[PDB]
Design a protein around this nucleic acid. Structure first.
Ligand code: G2P
Ligand code: MN
Ligand code: MN
Ligand code: NA
Ligand code: NA
Length: 320
DNA sequence: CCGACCCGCATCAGC
DNA sequence: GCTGATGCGC
DNA sequence: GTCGG
């Protein structure tokens, strides 16, 4: 329930705009409309009712109308049956395959995972890993496994250097009972926004997590951001846990609070807070907040919320 | 009538 | 080789 | 696609 038909249609339309039309602002417009419609405490019986809502215009009104009177949207019906368009859309579910790679693959007749499999030579490293773990990466992670994951990360990080500080953020820090991946924020006293008194600070941590076979694969790795794969250890004759996505971001120790707000999310929440900062006359990123002027000061997450006239919403409530 | 719409890394284009 | 641009995911 | 200068 919950304007579910309209919200589902709009998200499907959003996905088509992103993956097939390569029209990112349309995708976002559909997502915004869907999220405002999902917040509406009433059942929409007309396109104009919907139109009174912020982010809903004439075209979405037109769609709600057809959908209400027919239970269907001809455009989506046609799109769903379209071999080329459905395949391009499907292939973007592989991590590392975006709209462009998906269209190039479908162009050459590569439309399915099996096509991908027998065409390894045509995949970059990221894409080969997205394909190897396609099922796993769409699996959800129970909070119980999350905590076993946090134990390992925190254990191994302090084993490299007791001065490190690791914080699991993302849906985890927001109390989610399941997560899509693990987001880890890392700080060390050597790395500060003013000087980098030690090198390899992120590398040593990844290496350690690799040595104890927690991290199994690398999708991207630079001085400040790791994107990869990890896996909880198993017991004797026990079904192996799924492989899971893990991201690690090394933030300067003096911008930890901007980091936590950033990596805690959500993504729709973030761009709803970022889109609010600009109208209060502020800029928000994972490092600072600025009027852009010098770095406005911070030592708490509520400090950011007051700046833009926002009442503190707890991590659990940032699930927008 | 039309422009705006919230950064790190891998790979590509090109000099 | 190198810079700069683009794709991708965040 | 939607909003607003
Ligand atoms: N300013 C932005 N921040 C983002 C964006 N996407 C993610 N994030 C921030 O990083 C945090 C982690 O992003 P993820 O892609 O892993 C999604 P999240 O952790 O919120 O939930 P899961 O599905 O359980 O992984 C997210 O909460 C926030 C974005 O597009 N823009
Ligand atoms: Mn996450
Ligand atoms: Mn993540
Ligand atoms: Na409206
Ligand atoms: Na993808």
């Amino acid at each position: 329930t919950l304007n579910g038909g309209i919200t589902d249609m709009l998200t499907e339309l959003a996905n088509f705009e992103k993956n097939v039309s390569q029209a990112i602002h349309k995708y976002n417009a559909y997502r915004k409309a869907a999220s405002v419609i999902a917040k509406y405490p009433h059942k929409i019986k007309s396109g104009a009712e919907a139109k009174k809502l912020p982010g809903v215009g004439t075209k979405i009104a037109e769609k709600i109308d057809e959908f209400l009177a027919t239970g269907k949207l001809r455009k989506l019906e046609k799109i769903r049956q379209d071999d080329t368009s459905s395949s391009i859309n499907f292939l973007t579910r592989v991590s590392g395959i975006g709209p462009s790679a998906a269209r190039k693959f479908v162009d050459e007749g590569i439309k399915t995972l099996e096509d991908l499999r027998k065409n390894e030579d045509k995949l970059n490293h990221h894409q080969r890993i997205g394909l190897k773990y396609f099922g796993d990466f769409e699996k959800r992670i129970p909070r119980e496994e999350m905590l076993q994951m946090q134990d390992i990360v925190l254990n191994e990080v302090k084993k490299v250097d007791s001065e490190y500080i690791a914080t699991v953020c993302g849906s985890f820090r927001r109390g989610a009972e399941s997560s899509g991946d693990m987001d880890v924020l890392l700080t060390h006293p050597s790395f500060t926004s003013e000087s980098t008194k030690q090198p390899k600070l992120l590398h040593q941590v990844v290496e350690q997590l690799q040595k104890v076979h927690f991290i199994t694969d690398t999708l991207s790795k630079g001085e400040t951001k790791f994107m990869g794969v990890c896996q909880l250890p198993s017991k004797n004759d026990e079904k192996e846990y799924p492989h899971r996505r893990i991201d690690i971001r090394l933030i300067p120790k003096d911008q930890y609070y901007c980091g936590v707000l950033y990596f805690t999310g959500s993504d729709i929440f973030n761009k709803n807070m970022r889109a609010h900062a600009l109208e209060k006359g502020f800029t928000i990123n994972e490092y600072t907040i600025r009027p852009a002027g010098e770095p406005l000061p911070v030592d708490s997450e509520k400090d950011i919320f007051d700046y833009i006239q926002w009442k503190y919403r707890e991590p659990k409530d940032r699930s927008e």
